[PDB]
Amino acid sequence: RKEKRKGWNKPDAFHVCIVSYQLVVQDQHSFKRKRWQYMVLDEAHNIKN
Amino acid sequence: KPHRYKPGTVALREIRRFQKSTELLIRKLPFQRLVREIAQDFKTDLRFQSSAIGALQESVEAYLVSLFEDTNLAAIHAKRVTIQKKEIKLARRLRGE
Amino acid sequence: KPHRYKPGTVALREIRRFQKSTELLIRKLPFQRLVREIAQDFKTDLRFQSSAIGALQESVEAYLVSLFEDTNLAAIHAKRVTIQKKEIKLARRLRGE
DNA sequence: GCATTAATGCATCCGCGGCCGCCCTGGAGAATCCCGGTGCCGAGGCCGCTCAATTGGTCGTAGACAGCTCTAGCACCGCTTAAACGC
DNA sequence: CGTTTAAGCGGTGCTAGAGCTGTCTACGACCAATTGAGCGGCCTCGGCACCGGGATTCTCCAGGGCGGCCGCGGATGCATTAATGC
């Protein structure tokens, strides 16, 4: 993931990122830095609490 | 062509890495069950606060660090880089224990 | 035919001789002028009783005996019978000094 | 039929040829330092409150000031060996 | 091993500092009244936490020219054996 995040900040190396559900709990300090346009939630009965 | 370090390099950067860190190297749950394990046969059905566990772990960690430094100097006196059991008995006995 | 002992015999009977004796091994007059010499530059024109000199000589003698025993065990750890300066620095530093 | 004798099927002996490994120099690779970049959270400021410090009075009480005494430390002189020292 | 300098010890004349005892007098223990500085509560925002970008220095990487071998086969000595002449 550090190798994925070494071409991440300054240029636009991707138009859409695929991040799992449980990885944002650990990497929430890192994914909050970059601004996003769309964030979608698949099968949203997990975040219902 | 694999890239491997010679024996003796990673220990130095581990000294540089951990000697700059003030964090605790022992986890809270095995020290918790260990403290409760020693506290089992002394007095049954005791309670421990959220504090006073990192104090025992802190004095155990720093006292064991100073014991590893005195034992390390004892192994230095033996003109070698390896720590032995007689170095721990020597540096343990010569401190008044 | 001269009669001479091998090296290592007279030290053992000196251990047997002096270890059975409780007398002081330091004379009273060089310890007197030494105590007055250290007492010269602290406070001028002092007086010393007839007591309190064999107490300093007694604690100096017994403390130096225990230091020679710990330093002797330190030289034993080096797998030799000779005492060295690094043994005195080792056994002196490892006692908390 | 038997000796012998040349042919010949192997004989060990000799001679020629192949086997590379260790110092010196070709740089390769990633760990660290430092400077931004933005989200996070507890240090301290502000307020409400509130209680032992402060001030003064009372009262009695041990500590410094002599006072006097007394007694072992100080400085010393001279036999008498005895550890310290040089080698 | 032999040779010396100096403590141990017996005895001496002192004194100056150690040591037990009255006086009173500063001077601290014990007690009311005020309050103001310090302590519980709070809620913010600028320094702190973590990591990218990039330069820098860290720390290891694999090929290149100098020696003395053993592996093996040709040989052609030896011994045999059937041809063959007696």
UniProtKB/Swiss-Prot annotation, chain A:
Coiled-coil residue windows: none
Cell compartments where the protein resides: Nucleus
Positions occupied by motif DEAH box: 42-45
Note: Present with 656 molecules/cell in log phase SD medium.
Functional description taken from the UniProt entry: Catalytic component of the SWR1 complex which mediates the ATP-dependent exchange of histone H2A for the H2A variant HZT1 leading to transcriptional regulation of selected genes by chromatin remodeling.
Entry similarity comment: Belongs to the SNF2/RAD54 helicase family. SWR1 subfamily.
Subunit structure comment from the entry: Component of the SWR1 chromatin-remodeling complex composed of at least ACT1, ARP4, RVB1, RVB2, ARP6, YAF9, VPS71, VPS72, SWC3, SWC4, SWC5, SWC7 and SWR1, and perhaps BDF1.
Full protein name: Helicase SWR1
Gene encoding the protein: SWR1
Residues of the whole record sequence present: 783 to 831 of 1514
Curated annotation (Swiss-Prot), chains B, C:
Gene Ontology terms describing biological process: aerobic respiration; chromatin organization; global genome nucleotide-excision repair; intracellular copper ion homeostasis; nucleolar large rRNA transcription by RNA polymerase I; positive regulation of transcription by RNA polymerase I; regulation of DNA-templated transcription; rRNA transcription
Modified residues (N6-acetyllysine): K1, K20, K28
Statement: the UniProt record of this protein carries the keyword Phosphoprotein: yes
Compartment(s) where it occurs, according to its Swiss-Prot or TrEMBL record: Nucleus; Chromosome
Annotated positions of the N6,N6,N6-trimethyllysine modification: K43
Modified residues (N6-malonyllysine): K20
Alphabetic keyword roster: Acetylation, Chromosome, DNA-binding, Methylation, Nucleosome core, Nucleus, Phosphoprotein
Recorded GO CC terms: CENP-A containing nucleosome; nucleosome; nucleus; RNA polymerase I upstream activating factor complex
N6-propionyllysine, modified sites: K20
GO MF terms, alphabetically ordered: cupric reductase (NADH) activity; DNA binding; protein heterodimerization activity; structural constituent of chromatin
Modified residues (N6-succinyllysine): K43
Residue numbers bearing the N6-methyllysine modification: K1, K43
Residue ranges the record marks as coiled coil: none
Post-translational modification: Phosphorylated by IPL1 to form H3S10ph in a cell cycle-dependent manner during mitosis and meiosis. H3S10ph is also formed by SNF1, promotes subsequent H3K14ac formation by GCN5, and is required for transcriptional activation through TBP recruitment to the promoters. Dephosphorylation is performed by GLC7. Mono-, di- and trimethylated by the COMPASS complex to form H3K4me1/2/3. H3K4me activates gene expression by regulating transcription elongation and plays a role in telomere length maintenance. H3K4me enrichment correlates with transcription levels, and occurs in a 5' to 3' gradient with H3K4me3 enrichment at the 5'-end of genes, shifting to H3K4me2 and then H3K4me1. Methylated by SET2 to form H3K36me. H3K36me represses gene expression. Methylated by DOT1 to form H3K79me. H3K79me is required for association of SIR proteins with telomeric regions and for telomeric silencing.
Coarse class of the protein's main subcellular location: nucleus
Modified residues (N6,N6-dimethyllysine): K43
Subunit structure, interactors included: The nucleosome is a histone octamer containing two molecules each of H2A, H2B, H3 and H4 assembled in one H3-H4 heterotetramer and two H2A-H2B heterodimers. The octamer wraps approximately 147 bp of DNA. Histone H3 is a component of the UAF (upstream activation factor) complex, which consists of UAF30, RRN5, RRN9, RRN10, and histones H3 and H4.
Extra remark beyond the main annotation: Present with 213000 molecules/cell in log phase SD medium.
Function: Core component of nucleosome. Nucleosomes wrap and compact DNA into chromatin, limiting DNA accessibility to the cellular machineries which require DNA as a template. Histones thereby play a central role in transcription regulation, DNA repair, DNA replication and chromosomal stability. DNA accessibility is regulated via a complex set of post-translational modifications of histones, also called histone code, and nucleosome remodeling.
Family (UniProt): Belongs to the histone H3 family.
Protein name: Histone H3
Gene designation: HHT1
